[PDB]
């Protein structure tokens, strides 16, 4: 009965500075990998003994993924700024938590896809992995778009695939 | 391993 989570957060800075982006990974509630844009050389880093038996290609790949994520967060913070009719001088946070609960068998017990804005829940994937709960109307807009684009299918491609397999590869290492 | 980029909000 194991689990894997990622918490990717960004906090926008007033002025022309890029947001502060972090990515934290957990296997069975234990932090195993971490990224921080404030680092002198922003890379994904192993936070656990068994993680550093991974090749350099792994680290490079996921680091690039982190870069792309920085882009996503900077764009969508703007989007949310728009939705909520907020002054552009403020500071704001956006968080993406996602992952998978895999049973004793090795099967996907549960999938997680959740987004929060300024501490408050924004939108989340329901247990059936095909429905969304939307906090407010701003969230209702996102729910509409994502329902037309079939976002749940897309996220499910990860949740039902790489999440489980990578979780297992990570358990082997323990 | 990290997930692919989410859809825009």
């Amino acid at each position, epitope marked *: 009965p194991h689990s894997m989570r990622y918490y990717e957060t960004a906090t926008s800075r007033r002025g022309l500075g890029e947001p502060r982006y972090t990515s934290v990974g957990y296997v069975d509630d234990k932090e195993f990998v971490r990224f921080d844009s404030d680092a002198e050389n922003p890379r994904y880093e192993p936070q656990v003994p068994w993680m550093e038996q991974e090749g350099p290609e792994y680290w490079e790949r996921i680091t690039q993924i982190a870069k792309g994520q920085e*882009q996503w967060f900077r*764009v969508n913070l703007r989007t949310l700024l728009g939705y909520y009719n907020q002054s552009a001088g403020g500071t704001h946070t956006l968080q993406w938590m996602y992952g998978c609960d895999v049973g004793s068998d090795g099967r996907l017990l549960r999938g997680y896809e959740q987004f929060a804005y300024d501490g408050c829940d924004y939108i989340a994937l329901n247990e059936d992995l095909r429905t969304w709960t939307a906090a407010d109307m701003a969230a209702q807009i996102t729910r509409r778009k994502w329902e037309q*684009a079939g976002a749940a*299918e*897309y996220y*499910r491609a990860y949740l039902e695939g790489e999440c489980v397999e990578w979780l297992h590869r990570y358990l082997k290492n323990g | 391993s990290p997930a*692919p980029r989410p*859809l825009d909000l």
Partner: T-cell receptor
Amino acid sequence: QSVTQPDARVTVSEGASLQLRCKYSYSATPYLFWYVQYPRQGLQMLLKYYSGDPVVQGVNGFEAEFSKSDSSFHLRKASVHWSDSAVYFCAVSAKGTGSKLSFGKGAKLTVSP
Amino acid sequence: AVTQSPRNKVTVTGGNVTLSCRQTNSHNYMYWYRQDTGHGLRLIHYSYGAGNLQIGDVPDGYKATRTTQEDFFLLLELASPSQTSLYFCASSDAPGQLYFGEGSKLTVLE
């Protein structure tokens, strides 16, 4: 990285069954798409597949099927309408780069009446 | 709702052409493709958000600018005959799901 449609041009009879073939070559499972282009127009998304049930069923009578073993995403219609005459593009995007579509060279469909 | 201009354009080798694309969707992804017989659609440049540029498959001889969320320009400083083609613009808000313009037909003469 490649997307292959074998037949550049296909002629079928009206009411007859149509299959447009598409094999992709990608290292991991990509996201799969069919686009249609009627004369003097841009491309329009016909079908999409991200995950799950391999058979994606369009409301227009079309349906495409993701086959992992065969590395295919063939398009099908049990009975073509004359208004189905168009150019059909198979398209895939890599798993890490889902926003970068690579297209097949297309299949021009002629529905002879 | 994608709009391209000009829809038709004829220049000569060495000429300077600018294709304009505007989308009133709130899409952050925009693309410039070219279509030729026996080549299907080939990506030249694309963009995610205002100010962001990204190299496509056939970027050579092409420059691009994304001034705002809505505007994507394809720039051609030294028009070659090889650049005679049908240029499509597209916008997206979901991976792989593109909304196309009606096309800009460009002919380059010697």
